[PDB]
Design a protein around this nucleic acid. Structure first.
Lengths: 20, 143, 64, 117, 201
RNA sequence: UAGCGGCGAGCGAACGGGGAGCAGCCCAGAGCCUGAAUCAGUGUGUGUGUUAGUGGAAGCGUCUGGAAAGGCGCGCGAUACAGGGUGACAGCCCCGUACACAAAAAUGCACAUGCUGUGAGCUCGAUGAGUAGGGCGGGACACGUGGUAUCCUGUCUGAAUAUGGGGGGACCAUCCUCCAAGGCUAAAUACUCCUGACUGACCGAUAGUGAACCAGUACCGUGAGGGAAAGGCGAAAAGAACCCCGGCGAGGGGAGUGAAAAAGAACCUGAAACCGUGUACGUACAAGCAGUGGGAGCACGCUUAGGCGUGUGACUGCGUACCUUUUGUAUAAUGGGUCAGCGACUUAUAUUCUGUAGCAAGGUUAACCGAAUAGGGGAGCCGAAGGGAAACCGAGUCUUAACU
């Protein structure tokens, strides 16, 4: 009955802005 | 009478519970409107502050000047020379009558009530109707 | 700790027999010949407040 | 003096949910979407409370109309006959009494055709 | 006026502004609230979000991700908590004038008189520690719920009064409202009343 | 408050007053008597305190109950009814408790007195130079050089020597008052990692410290550092022999244990979300915030005589979610997966109103002492008289020569 669970915070962005 | 104790006709009236209750009329910003420095936080709107204008007192000029001679010249009443006992009345006697303090140096006797006590306004500056209430009545004047 | 006054303000204002305060008036300082001597005169003596001002000048003097 | 916020939460919920039964899907189950539901519920009750006396004051008129039509006159002409007759207005709901006795209604009709006439 | 007597029932009529004082709840209902407030430790637990054992480490690296808009784990809205107006040392002692103070114990006095429950009996002092003598002292005079309030000094009387929680140690000089009010029979010597006058009014 | 102040924001005393608490002394030198006070440190003891602890009181009957400490009935102890524990809420069941005792030693504190060193007590001398001022530049004073003293002093000078010198806020004078540039000193007061004892309108397991549980742990980071979760069966382990299914399984069912096992170890009470199973009823030609009003049919309680209630709702009239922000949102504008818990106008002080109480031309004490909420303590603060910039005058007073 061990437990280990973290939280994640890293980006899912890769896509670039529209119409600058 | 640990159960008959109570506010007389709502004498201790209960306070607000703002920040709660929709139907209360005190919910969410319930007495400071929506937005602005009226709402929000930051100590509220600053003292002296009256818009991004200058104060009205910074469009009036100053003039004061404190002599601190007037600060030590007190104003005692004529009928409050009744409140020490004895005929012999001085400046350092009226310390004791709690009305002339240590940093109090000078004082005028101002009209207000009849003394009734016969008094010597020795050590004290004096007004024209105060001295003539003690020449209307018993008294002595020579200071 | 104790509440404070705007000192500055406190010499534009002087107390009275009522809650009122007395102040001096504007346009007295230089260029006094292109201001009327009649203009200057009606501005020379002290005069009591006009209200609508009272709650920001007791908020500069909580000590009367 | 920590206050644990009573049990006052899912107790004042407990009301709503019990008065919110009978409802298809999460409309009753979920407290959020059984409160914006309970609102709307009451709102309608209060709405339709007055619509009762509309929809009946259509239902009545309708059927008084059919009755009289078959006999003699129109609706218009009828009603202005209980009127022209005086205390015997008989309401509109209880103008209809033709359900278990047509001839009960028919008497008013004939009486009213002569009041008009 | 009537505060009874040892062997009789009589008036003593040492005041009539302390025992002819007319009664309004309102004054007393302030004083009694003070005695309660002014026995009340103000020195409370809790801690603020500055006084958290946390740190400013930020659980996001600004926008780029949308787990929370909070920059802190020293927030008071956190699992850690913080509480925005956390308890600490606070004062709870009120002023109350000396003339309200006396004022109360004069209306309250002159209310027990109107509700005949104030008893002046003398020589209720006890010879020895043994509370079976301080039992019979109340009992035989058909009293319970007492204060046993006197300015006089008998230490065996202070000691013995501590057992049984329907009586506590009371003194004329130590006098207050709440103690009169609760402990309905009110027990005092001829000497006690004479001193109670100067102390109060 | 005075005053300083891009006279902005703001900073903010002192003098004086009341208290708390109070002791003064050496050296810059010759004496005179020559440990003489006085401390200090060494003794050695007397007392008291602490660090071990000890003793320490008085109830039974009966009823309900798994069990009595509850109820009922009859008693008793109290310098002890503080608290905790013991099978439910116990003064008399136990541990304690007040109270009364108790130290081999080791030390805290007073005092006893030896020694050791210290230097006193009378005479007469002494009265702190590269310094104080001052020029230059800063800092500290409430005080930003500003009219700006004064104090600290990095730089450069540079004075007097008690018929003298310093200061009293530019500065001189006068007058008052004091002697720097040598040095030490108790107390009143501040603070709390830690120790003990107690107390709390402080918390009670998402709280309280992070942390009641092998927690600064596990984990996370190269590091510095960051940093959780996870409490409870029951009165008592009596922790379920034995039998059975199964894989000498797990797990479950029985069987007993137990007052309870929906008390069985993921164990208290066990909600809610969520997800099933059953039963009743409805529903597979009908469009849309899914509900609401009407309302047929059906099952139940028969409505137990009665056309009724409960549950359900075909059909049919209505009816575009909530919050927010807006000129305006059903909006394809915002937010919300849902649920539980938690989460945001307070608190401290001063101040101003309003109400209300107390005392009322007086009101009221602050800090503090204190048998510490009492009582004592009016220092003081505010009003009762204002006007003026002040000087000053006062029911008037400025303005002004002026009364108009």
């Amino acid at each position: 009955a061990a437990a280990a669970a973290a939280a994640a915070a890293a980006a899912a962005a890769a896509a670039a802005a529209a119409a600058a | 009478r640990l159960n008959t104790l109570s506010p007389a006709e709502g004498s201790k009236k209960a306070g607000k519970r703002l920040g709660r209750g929709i139907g209360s009329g005190l919910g969410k910003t319930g007495g400071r409107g929506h937005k602005g420095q009226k709402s929000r936080s930051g100590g509220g709107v600053r003292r002296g502050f009256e818009g991004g204008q200058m104060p009205l007192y910074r469009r009036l000029p100053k003039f004061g000047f404190t002599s601190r001679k007037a600060a030590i010249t007190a104003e005692i009443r004529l009928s409050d020379l009744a409140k020490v006992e004895g005929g012999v009345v001085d400046l350092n006697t009226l310390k004791a009558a709690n009305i002339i303090g240590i940093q109090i140096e000078f004082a005028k006797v101002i009209l207000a009530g009849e003394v009734t006590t016969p008094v010597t306004v020795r050590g004290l500056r004096v007004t024209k109707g105060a001295r003539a209430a003690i020449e209307a009545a018993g008294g002595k004047i020579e200071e | 700790p104790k509440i404070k006054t705007v000192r500055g303000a406190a010499k534009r204002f002087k107390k009275t027999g009522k809650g009122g305060f007395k102040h001096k008036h504007a346009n007295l300082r230089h260029i006094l010949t292109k201001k009327a001597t009649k203009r200057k005169r009606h501005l020379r003596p002290k005069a009591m407040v006009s209200k609508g001002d009272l709650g920001l000048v007791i908020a500069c003097l909580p000590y009367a | 003096a920590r206050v644990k916020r009573g049990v006052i939460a899912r107790a004042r919920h407990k009301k709503i949910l019990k008065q919110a039964k009978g409802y298809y899907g999460a409309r009753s189950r979920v407290y959020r979407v059984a409160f914006q539901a309970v609102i709307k519920a009451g709102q309608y009750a209060y709405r339709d409370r007055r619509q009762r006396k509309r929809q009946f004051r259509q239902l009545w008129i309708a059927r008084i109309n059919a009755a009289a039509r078959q006999n003699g006159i129109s609706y218009s002409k009828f009603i202005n006959g209980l009127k022209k007759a005086s205390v015997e207005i008989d309401r509109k709901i209880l103008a209809d009494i033709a359900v278990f006795d047509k001839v009960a209604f028919t008497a008013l009709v004939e009486k009213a055709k002569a009041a008009l006439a | 006026m009537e505060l009874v007597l040892k062997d009789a029932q009589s008036a003593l009529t040492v005041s009539e502004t302390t025992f002819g004082r007319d009664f309004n709840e309102a004054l007393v209902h302030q004083v009694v609230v003070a005695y309660a407030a002014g026995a009340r430790q103000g020195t409370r637990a809790q801690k603020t979000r500055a006084e958290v054992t946390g740190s400013g480490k930020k659980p996001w690296r600004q926008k780029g991700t949308g787990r929370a808009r909070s920059g802190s784990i020293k927030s008071p809205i956190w699992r850690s908590g913080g509480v925005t107006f956390a308890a600490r040392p606070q004062d709870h002692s009120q002023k109350v004038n000396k003339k309200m103070y006396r004022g109360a114990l004069k209306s309250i006095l002159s209310e027990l008189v109107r509700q005949d429950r104030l008893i002046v009996v003398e020589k209720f002092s006890v010879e020895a520690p043994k509370t079976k003598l301080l039992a019979q002292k109340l009992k035989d005079m058909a009293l319970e719920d007492v204060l046993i309030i006197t300015g006089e000094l008998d230490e065996n009387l202070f000691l013995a009064a501590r057992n049984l929680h329907k009586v506590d140690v009371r003194d004329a000089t130590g006098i207050d409202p709440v103690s009169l009010i609760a402990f309905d029979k009110v027990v005092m010597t001829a000497d006690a009343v004479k001193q109670v006058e100067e102390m109060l009014a």
